[PDB]
Design an enzyme around this catalytic site. Structure first.
Site, PDB file in Angstrom:
ATOM      1  N   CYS A 109       0.835  -1.199   0.000  1.00 59.74           N
ATOM      2  CA  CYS A 109       0.000   0.000   0.000  1.00 59.74           C
ATOM      3  C   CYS A 109       0.869   1.248   0.000  1.00 59.74           C
ATOM      4  O   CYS A 109       1.615   1.491   0.954  1.00 59.74           O
ATOM      5  CB  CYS A 109      -0.940   0.039   1.209  1.00 59.74           C
ATOM      6  N   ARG A 112      -0.021   4.447   3.021  1.00 62.36           N
ATOM      7  CA  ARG A 112       0.005   4.232   4.465  1.00 62.36           C
ATOM      8  C   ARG A 112       0.435   5.442   5.277  1.00 62.36           C
ATOM      9  O   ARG A 112       0.390   5.362   6.507  1.00 62.36           O
ATOM     10  CB  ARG A 112       0.923   3.069   4.798  1.00 62.36           C
ATOM     11  N   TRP A 281      -9.004   6.500  -0.631  1.00 61.84           N
ATOM     12  CA  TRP A 281      -9.271   7.260  -1.842  1.00 61.84           C
ATOM     13  C   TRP A 281      -8.323   6.783  -2.923  1.00 61.84           C
ATOM     14  O   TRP A 281      -7.295   6.160  -2.642  1.00 61.84           O
ATOM     15  CB  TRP A 281      -9.138   8.771  -1.632  1.00 61.84           C
ATOM     16  N   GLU A 286      -4.560   4.053 -10.633  1.00 61.46           N
ATOM     17  CA  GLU A 286      -5.385   2.858 -10.479  1.00 61.46           C
ATOM     18  C   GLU A 286      -6.528   2.858 -11.480  1.00 61.46           C
ATOM     19  O   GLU A 286      -6.787   1.849 -12.147  1.00 61.46           O
ATOM     20  CB  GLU A 286      -5.941   2.794  -9.064  1.00 61.46           C
TER      21      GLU A 286
END
Ligand code: HEM
Ligand SMILES: CNCc1cncc(-c2cc(C)cc(N)n2)c1
Ligand SMILES: C[C@H](O)[C@H](O)[C@H]1CNc2nc(N)[nH]c(=O)c2N1
Ligand SMILES: [Zn+2]
Length: 411
Positions: A109, A112, A281, A286
């Site tokens: 991720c 973070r 969000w 992506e």
């Protein structure tokens, strides 16, 4: 044993000792590295207390009361409950700590830096799929916050025997439908074509278009899952327009604001939460790179090259690259002009370097998966491309888990 990771753009070095607390195995050996394998490799009561103890020790360490009276009693208390029940229940404080650190430990991720700002919704009193639907709707409405997106996680009851599992069968709370076609092609989202069909199997009436939000398929207490439609006023959507190309609107693209993973497993103190939908969000790429330009997704590089007037005959005209950039300026601009939270891959990767710095300082490291942290476009002009990263498995953690329809004993 106290390893160094270097950044080759700034020459900054940081020392990782956090990997010593790492417990689980990576897939790599001394003679093979599996760092690009996507998903590399009932629980009993003996195995359960070390996991409880290890977790409780770090929780009580965190509130600056390691080994105090409250700790040693809760230690004793959970041991006694693992005797009595062969399992145990987390305190509300422990659940929030565990969830926040499952995110903090998510090495794949890039977001973070926000890990301590997570809203934890305790749904462990849920008992039916209708309750799940209601909890999930409240999650969606909260995390959306009118486009000022807020990260959040909803934690349904923990696995007990194994045949009583709470599962969201959706891989994300909000996904677009995928219908194969009579001519063998695909409308909507090819990723979801099987799941889109499972909903039809369970009775979904499909509006066979493009951006058709899918219905929740919610399994409660191991029961056969049931369909529920998220009230469309709760599904915020961004129309994608470009700030230059007024033919962009004719493309007719849109994406939902809320990225909310619902198919993973939250592990806390050895307890397994099989349904734990969590949302943040979007990072532009992506949507604009993977969702829109993956060959087996929406696969829109085709038309965006066309309307831009690009040489598509030659591979080396980089028409794919050029259309890919416009698409991501458009995703970003569309979200920003609508006050829907989105982060670009430059800001997001800059923050993750900053987050990495904080982790190495006040925590001694930050597990990180380079293969996943580096954005899927313009990799080397982001700072994470040049940042060495150690990947290791800390717990609490989010784990992958089988798709429910491969494992569920129906009826
Ligand atoms: C707050 C803003 C956030 C941003 C910008 C962000 C960014 C990202 C991105 C870009 C990915 C890669 C997804 C993919 O490539 O498929 C990812 C993966 C992941 N994120 Fe974060 N995320 C955010 C919030 C969260 C939250 C709230 C959680 C959990 C509580 C979380 C946990 C994870 C996990 C477990 C993965 C890897 C699992 C997977 O998708 O394969 N993220 N994140
Ligand atoms: C395999 N990962 C699935 C997936 C797909 N789409 C989006 C995400 C995602 C999830 C979260 C919490 C934040 C974000 N920015 N993105 C994850
Ligand atoms: C083969 C490879 O492991 C796979 O394509 C990975 C690469 N890196 C990725 N990185 C992110 N963020 N998301 C992904 O789905 C993938 N896919
Ligand atoms: Zn490796």
């Amino acid at each position: 044993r106290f390893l160094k990771v270097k950044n080759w753009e700034t020459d900054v070095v940081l020392t990782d000792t956090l990997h010593l607390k790492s417990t689980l195995e990576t897939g790599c050996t001394e003679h093979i590295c599996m760092g690009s394998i996507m998903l590399p490799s009932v629980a009993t009561k003996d195995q359960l207390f070390p996991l409880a103890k290890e977790f409780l020790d770090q929780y009580y360490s965190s509130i600056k009361r390691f080994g105090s009276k409250a700790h040693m009693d809760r230690l004793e208390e959970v041991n006694k409950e693992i005797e009595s029940t062969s399992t145990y229940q987390l305190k509300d404080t422990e659940l929030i700590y565990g969830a926040k650190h499952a995110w903090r430990n998510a090495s794949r991720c890039v977001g973070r830096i926000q890990w301590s700002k997570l809203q934890v919704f305790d749904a462990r009193d849920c008992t039916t799929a209708h309750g799940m639907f209601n909890y999930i709707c409240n999650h969606v409405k909260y995390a959306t916050n009118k486009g000022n997106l807020r990260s959040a996680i909803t934690i349904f009851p923990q696995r007990t025997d194994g045949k009583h599992d709470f599962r969201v069968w959706n891989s994300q709370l909000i996904r677009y439908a995928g219908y194969k076609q009579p001519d063998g092609s695909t409308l909507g989202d090819p990723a979801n074509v099987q799941f889109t069909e499972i909903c039809i199997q369970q009775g979904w009436k499909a509006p066979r278009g493009r951006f058709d939000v899918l219905p929740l398929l919610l399994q409660a207490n191991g029961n056969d899952p049931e369909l529920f439609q998220i009230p469309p006023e709760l599904v915020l959507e961004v129309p994608i327009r470009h700030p230059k190309f007024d033919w962009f609107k004719d493309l007719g693209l849109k994406w939902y604001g809320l990225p909310a993973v619902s198919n993973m497993l939250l592990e806390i103190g050895g307890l397994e939460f099989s349904a734990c939908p969590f949302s943040g969000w979007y990072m532009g790429t992506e949507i604009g790179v993977r969702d829109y330009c993956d060959n087996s997704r929406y696969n829109i590089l085709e038309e965006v090259a066309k309307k831009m007037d690009l040489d598509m005959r030659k591979t080396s005209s980089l028409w794919k690259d050029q259309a890919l950039v416009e698409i991501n300026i458009a995703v970003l601009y569309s979200f920003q002009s609508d006050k829907v939270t989105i982060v670009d891959h430059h800001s997001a990767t800059e923050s993750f370097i900053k987050h990495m710095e904080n982790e190495y300082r006040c925590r001694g490291g930050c597990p990180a998966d380079w293969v996943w942290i580096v954005p899927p476009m313009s990799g080397s002009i982001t700072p994470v491309f040049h940042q060495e990263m150690l990947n290791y498995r800390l717990t609490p953690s989010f784990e992958y888990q089988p798709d429910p329809w491969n494992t569920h004993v129906w009826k």
